[PDB]
Design a protein around this ligand. Structure first.
Ligand SMILES: [Zn+2]
Ligand SMILES: [Zn+2]
Ligand SMILES: [Zn+2]
Ligand SMILES: [Zn+2]
Lengths: 1176, 10, 116, 69
DNA sequence: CATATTTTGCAAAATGACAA
RNA sequence: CCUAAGAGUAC
DNA sequence: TTGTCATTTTGCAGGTACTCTTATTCAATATG
């Protein structure tokens, strides 16, 4: 405070977190990745390759025309505009997101590229080398190549610079965070796709049956090239007891595993000593030499580089190259296919040889039991592809398709000698349709579920969806490296448990930077180049890796790491760059690629003034941050970037997190060494060598888990249940829900901010958009109607508005051009001249075929009246005349739903055809069967509802809103539920807010002391009286406020019954689903239960009369159903058998008849006979 | 094995 | 074993029988470089490997912050502070004996008792 | 959304005590507990009714009216 | 201008010899 | 209407 | 006139019910 350099406390860190969320936000990774893709990656994709050259040779039959031409097309700078929409009339105007959402447009912006066309001419003189020159016809002229969808709030969106007032004007919720696309009016979010990192050597043991014992592999890939995956594997043949332990490498496009020494000799290292030096860096390590001698013994047959190249070419799978050119083929394999991530040029054989030696070294170290096999689940070995890289690779493929099409068109128009035009060449539909298809559907091509419909049930649900990662498929386990990067307890319970993860609150994903400045820094500061590195003269040299590429060695790694840290801590190096120094392995790794997940941490320095380790951040920085925050709600601004640029906080990912020591809290772990028995037991770690400090432990949780009060007092599965269940909580998802035509919307009448609240939930805006209510809960075995997770809800409380909800549903309908003049028309169908008119009443429709808002609608009533033209002059069906030129295509209300029509919206689609949306509003009032849950995984349905007079009451007349069974508590061990009830009682009495943050020093004893100071029993018990008789209950009841969510699972949306209804057209069985009035599945194991019961006739009735009973005729000669049965004429005849008096009828399921007919169609005769030919 | 996890064998 | 290489073409040298002197003779397989043998040992196979447990020790191993510190007696400096770590041999049957490196003398001493 | 008319549990009318509560919080710089006690909310049911309310209607009022007369 | 076609878990069964 | 995909409920 | 032993190829399928939403149906060059 008064002292500027005083150390900070645990309370001060929340100021730092506030600054972080003031600069980053909650969906910063999405926007950052997209901005990186738009600003830089599009230009790189355009410039790389995309130079179409077509050399039209002279083909001179006569020397008069011995001129060869060469047409080249190049792409210059790319311009991406603000989002705009075309129109049926051709007028183009600015498009805003809350117009694309309503009109089912795509929030996309056009792309233009400066295309330069050049032509060269040369004299086709045989023998003489051709020399091409300009003809001075340099034409260049931007062209429209497609449209890129733009995510909201990105740098190229209209809302990026919008203020709060502007957002209100544009019908946009200020709480909306962006980070999603609008494809055809639907909000789509790109789930972060997890993958294994590239250019990292991983060594794995193999099982006993396999001949290879250990395999070292690298998934080599280059970012600035073809972006192709080539997998190099180095395998150690022979088990432990085997003698012939030869190491072999699996080169691409080679049918066999070449021995390693052959590869070394091919690269240009002939002597055995030099090869072993390249492989083994220690002369004294005779074990590795002994293990490696079989390789040189195997390769002794080849003693020359050309011989090795010929050997590789002979093993080459092409088998279409002459003997002397096999050398060239092998050279190409070793240049453009072997370790592409190192280089694609020539003259770098030594670097690739060194890398191969390093891989073999790692393999031999793992085989010698000197290091464990690499863990596949280490989160530092994983990368998350965000919207940026995904769109980048998709656009790369799509633009390659477009440029191949351009080249094909140019070839076609030059071979046919037609004129050349740019507009006829480019096909923007390619890029536009490809991007729209990849984003509209889950699939990512031409993987699945990459893009998903954004969840808008609740604000926290939307936030969790926007920070979701999926792993394509023990990988399901919660790894140690997941600390502080993904939520420890937030994952689906089903098949995706552990595979689907959620980012922690402060976790970010790197967007990738150019490693050239770092390489220049390394070269300047004294990094030895790898070309002239001799391991013998520099034994204790630290290998320096940049993005998995071994760039050289350094002899003083300590000073190099210190200066790299200083540069990154002053901003000269991008803070996303991760630098790891492994002292034991003598390695230095620098990673700058995208997809790395990191988190911020406080920096701890020596602090010689105090004589002990201390945080770099002091009270002065906290005061400046507080001043900036107060000014935002005139001095110099102090933001999170200010802390970053002055070396106060650092970005650490899992790889760098391996080589640091972190203090959990500053106030207890930094200073060197009568305790409260109520406080939990903590240790000081008895060690003072910390390098970093956690900003706050509660930041390891995700968005959904940050809502849980006292999550550290709960059993972990309960926290997981609440994390999965708060996304289904009902509240206010956005403030502008009144101007959005969403398919389904649920809103609480009276959302209440929790009495027990966490510090992390005011960055999630939970107090502004709550999704629950504070209900007075009593834990009591009152009437027996709350057993087995049932609950008793107060009917009087429901009558006054507790948990009441609004429900909106929207129906969309378009008119489509079936032809040139076959346009549909929205109108009120008339029974005189319309076909297939539904049984619902059309009365509520007025002239334009749309119910005006305010009209009550019940189930099956028609709300949108649409008709389509058909071919006239047809007579059938009994009441079909030439007047019936219109077929009804109306949209009725849901059969099980009803309400008041709220709003209807008419507009024009992209094609210019009128289409409408009808939003209908109803009110959901809690009833028996609705599902409610606390914030601790205590789900349950309403068993019964009692009025106020019947509920138990305290001496003050307070009656509970809810009664829950005690038996739900002991087995589930949800102590946090009880603690939060007590804290909420104290907070309601005292008027303060209960601080239910996880790892604070808030104990039950202190809360009880406050409650006793308020005049109540310290443990929350209250003397209650029975409602029916007024007599005191012998047992005192745990009583107090508790926060409950109303879940989306209401009984009225699940009740379903079917006596008889529509049948499937193929199998003649009941249809599937309650939305189609379907039937319940009587599955196999229900049939097994009925067999066990011994009820044969009930089983037959279920399988025949209840589902499908079909009478079919057969003959006694052949058991086939090929019997022609004219029932009215009473004539039965099986052609072929030529019988008419030997026919039977049988009752079999129609599915059985279909199976027999399909077997007959498959050349099998299932002859059915009605008598036994053999004795039992 | 199995399948999954023919046989072995077949 | 201490394998040695030819000094003419930098290639391996293999053991070879001799008749005139009945002695071990190391010979080159490509240039016929021939010389005497330093030791009769030509192949060592460590079924139980004792070395490699202290591997990874570096002249600045104390700079690692993750390595735990201790005040155990250093029997070359009598200094308290030092770093300690368990055996680096990753075999499943290795013992949990600790190794200590003094940060003022870089002398590695163990906590074993059978050896002492 | 907007302040509930009555306390859910007991039924005391609290819909007329929202503006007074805000005035006490702002003009008089009273803490929440004393302001709640001043308005007559003694049972913690009413206290949680008024204390935890979120006035979202202001946000709704920020947007321009759809049907403006 | 409109329709038509370009991750996982092995024991064997089979193969190439073979040796007098 | 079919197909595919995704999300979810109770085990 | 009979055993022998030692590499190379051989097939796959993953629980029971139930709810909801979204997209898409070959594009484009070519002849009648
Ligand atoms: Zn017949
Ligand atoms: Zn030699
Ligand atoms: Zn010492
Ligand atoms: Zn009340």
């Amino acid at each position: 405070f008064e002292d500027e350099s005083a150390p900070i406390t645990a309370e001060d860190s929340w100021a730092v977190i506030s600054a972080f969320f003031r600069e980053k936000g909650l969906v910063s990774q999405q926007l950052d990745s997209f901005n990186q893709f738009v600003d830089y990656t599009l230009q790189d994709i355009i410039c790389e390759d995309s130079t179409l050259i077509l050399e039209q040779l002279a083909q001179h039959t006569t020397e008069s025309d011995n001129i060869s031409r060469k047409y080249e097309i190049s792409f210059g700078k790319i311009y991406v505009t603000k989002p705009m929409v075309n129109e049926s009339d051709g007028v183009t105007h600015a498009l805003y997101p809350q117009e694309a959402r309503l009109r089912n447009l795509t929030y996309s912006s056009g792309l233009f590229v400066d295309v330069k066309k050049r032509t060269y001419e040369a004299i086709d003189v045989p023998g003489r080398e051709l020399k091409y020159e300009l003809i001075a016809e340099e034409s260049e002229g931007k062209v429209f190549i497609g449209r890129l969808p733009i995510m909201l709030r990105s740098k190229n969106c209209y809302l990026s610079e919008a203020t709060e007032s502007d957002l209100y004007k544009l019908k946009e919720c200020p709480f909306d965070m962006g980070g999603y696309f609008i494809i055809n009016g639907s909000e789509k979010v790109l789930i972060a796709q997890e993958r294994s990192a590239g250019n990292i050597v991983q060594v794995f043991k193999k099982a006993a049956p396999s001949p290879i014992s250990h395999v070292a592999e690298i998934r080599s890939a280059l970012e600035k090239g073809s972006r192709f995956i080539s997998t190099l594997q180095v395998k150690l043949y022979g088990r432990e007891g085997s003698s012939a332990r030869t190491i072999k490498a699996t080169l691409p496009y080679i049918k066999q595993d070449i021995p390693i020494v052959i590869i070394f000799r091919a690269l240009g290292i002939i002597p055995d000593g030099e090869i072993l030096e390249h492989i083994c860096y220690d002369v004294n390590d005779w074990q590795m030499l002994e293990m490696l001698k079989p390789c040189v013994e195997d390769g002794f047959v080849i003693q020359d580089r050309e011989t090795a190249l010929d050997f590789i070419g002979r093993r080459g799978t092409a088998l279409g190259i002459k003997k002397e050119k096999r050398i060239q083929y092998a050279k190409d394999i070793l240049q453009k296919e072997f370790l592409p991530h190192i280089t694609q040029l020539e003259g770098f054989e030594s670097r690739k040889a060194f890398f191969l030696g390093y891989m073999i070294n790692r393999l031999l170290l793992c085989a010698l039991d000197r290091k464990d096999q690499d863990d596949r689940d280490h989160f530092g070995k994983k990368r998350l592809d965000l919207a940026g890289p995904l769109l980048a690779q998709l656009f790369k493929t799509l633009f390659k398709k477009l440029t191949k099409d351009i080249f094909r068109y140019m070839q076609r128009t030059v071979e046919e000698a037609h004129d050349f035009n740019m507009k006829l060449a480019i096909n923007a539909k390619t890029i536009t349709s490809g991007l729209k298809y990849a984003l509209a559907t889950g699939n990512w091509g031409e993987r699945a579920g990459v893009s998903q419909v954004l969840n808008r049930y609740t604000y926290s649900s939307t936030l969790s969806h926007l920070r979701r990662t999926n792993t394509p498929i023990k990988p399901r386990q919660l790894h140690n490296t997941h600390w502080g990067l993904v939520c420890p307890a937030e994952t689906p319970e089903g098949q995706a448990c552990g595979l689907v993860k959620n980012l922690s609150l402060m976790s970010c994903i790197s967007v990738g930077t150019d490693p050239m400045p770092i390489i220049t820094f390394l070269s300047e500061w004294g990094m030895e180049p790898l070309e002239d590195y001799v391991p013998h003269q520099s034994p204790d040299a630290t290998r320096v890796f940049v993005n998995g590429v071994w760039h050289g060695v350094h002899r003083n790694p300590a000073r190099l790491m210190e200066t790299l840290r200083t540069l990154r801590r002053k901003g000269d190096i991008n803070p996303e760059v991760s630098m790891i120094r492994d002292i034991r392995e003598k390695e230095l790794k620098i990673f700058t690629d995208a997809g790395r997940v990191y988190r911020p941490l406080f920096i701890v320095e020596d602090d010689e003034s105090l004589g002990h380790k201390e945080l770099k951040v002091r009270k002065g920085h906290i005061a400046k941050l507080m001043a900036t925050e107060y000014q935002d709600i005139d001095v110099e601004e102090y933001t999170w970037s200010s802390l970053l640029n002055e070396g106060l906080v650092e970005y650490i990912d899992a790889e760098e997190e391996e080589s640091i020591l972190i203090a959990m809290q500053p106030e207890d772990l930094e200073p060197a060494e009568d305790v409260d028995p109520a406080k939990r037991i903590r240790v000081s770690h008895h060690a003072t060598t910390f390098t970093h400090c956690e900003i706050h432990p509660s930041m390891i949780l995700g968005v959904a888990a940050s809502i849980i009060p006292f999550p550290d007092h709960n059993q972990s599965p309960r926290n997981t249940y609440q994390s999965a269940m708060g996304k289904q909580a009902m509240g206010v998802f956005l403030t502008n829900y009144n101007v959005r035509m969403d398919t389904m919307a649920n809103i609480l009448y009276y959302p209440q901010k929790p009495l027990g609240t966490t510090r992390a939930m005011e960055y999630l805006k939970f107090r502004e958009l709550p999704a629950g209510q504070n209900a007075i809960v009593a834990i009591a075995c009152y009437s027996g109607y709350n057993q087995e997770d049932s609950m008793i809800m107060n009917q009087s409380s429901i009558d006054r508005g507790l948990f009441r909800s609004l429900f909106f549903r929207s129906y969309m309908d378009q008119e489509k051009k079936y032809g040139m003049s076959i346009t549909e028309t929205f109108e009120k169908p008339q029974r005189t001249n319309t076909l297939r008119m539904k049984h619902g009443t059309y009365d509520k429709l007025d002239d334009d075929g749309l119910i005006a808002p305010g009209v009550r609608v019940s189930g099956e009533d028609v709300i949108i009246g649409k008709t389509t033209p058909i071919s006239p002059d047809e007579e059938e069906l009994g009441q079909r005349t030439a007047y019936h030129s219109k077929r009804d295509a109306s949209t009725p209300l849901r059969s099980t739903e009803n309400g008041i029509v709220d709003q209807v919206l008419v507009t024009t689609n992209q094609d210019g055809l009128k289409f409408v949306k009808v939003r209908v509003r109803t009110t959901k009032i809690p009833q028996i069967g609705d599902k409610f849950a606390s914030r601790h995984g205590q789900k349950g349905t309403i068993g019964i509802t009692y009025r106020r007079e019947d509920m138990p009451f305290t001496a003050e007349g307070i009656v509970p809103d809810l009664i829950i069974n005690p038996h739900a508590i002991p087995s589930r061990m949800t102590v946090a539920h009880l603690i939060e009830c007590l804290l909420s009682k104290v907070a309601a009495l005292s008027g303060n807010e209960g601080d239910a943050s996880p790892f604070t020093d808030i104990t039950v004893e202190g809360i009880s002391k406050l409650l006793r100071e308020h005049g109540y029993q310290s443990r929350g018990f209250e003397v209650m009286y029975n409602g029916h008789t007024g007599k005191k209950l012998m047992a005192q009841i745990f009583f107090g406020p508790t926060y409950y969510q109303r879940l989306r699972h209401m009984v009225d949306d699940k009740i379903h019954a079917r006596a008889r209804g529509p049948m499937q057209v193929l199998t003649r069985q009941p249809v599937e689903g309650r939305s189609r009035d379907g039937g319940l599945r009587f599955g196999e194991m229900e049939r097994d239960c009925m067999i066990a019961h011994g009820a044969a006739s009930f089983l037959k009735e279920r399988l025949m009369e209840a589902s499908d009973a079909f009478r079919v005729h057969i003959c006694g000669i052949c058991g086939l159903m090929t019997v022609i049965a004219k029932l009215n004429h009473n004539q039965f005849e099986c052609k072929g058998c030529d019988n008419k008096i030997d026919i039977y009828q049988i009752h079999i399921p129609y599915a059985a008849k279909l199976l027999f007919q399909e077997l007959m169609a498959m050349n099998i005769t299932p002859r059915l006979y009605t008598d036994r030919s053999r004795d039992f | 094995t199995x399948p999954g996890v023919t046989x072995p064998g077949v | 074993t201490t394998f040695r290489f030819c000094r003419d073409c930098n290639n391996m040298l293999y053991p070879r029988e001799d008749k005139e002197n009945n002695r071990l003779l190391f010979e080159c397989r490509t240039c016929s470089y021939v010389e005497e043998a330093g030791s009769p040992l030509v192949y060592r196979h460590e079924l139980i490997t004792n070395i490699g447990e202290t591997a990874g020790v570096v002249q600045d191993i104390g700079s690692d912050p993750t390595l735990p510190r201790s005040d155990r007696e250093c029997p070359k400096c009598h200094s308290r502070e030092n770093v300690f770590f368990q055996s680096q041999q990753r075999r499943k049957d290795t013992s949990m004996v600790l190794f200590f490196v003094c940060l003022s003398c870089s002398h590695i001493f163990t906590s074993d008792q059978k050896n002492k | 959304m907007i302040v509930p008319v009555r306390c859910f549990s007991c039924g005391k009318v609290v819909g007329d005590k929202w503006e007074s509560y805000l005035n006490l919080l702002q003009e008089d710089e009273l803490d929440e507990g004393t302001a709640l006690s001043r308005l007559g909310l003694k049972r913690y049911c009413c206290r949680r009714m008024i204390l935890t309310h979120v006035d979202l209607i202001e946000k709704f009022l920020r947007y321009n009216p759809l049907e403006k007369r």
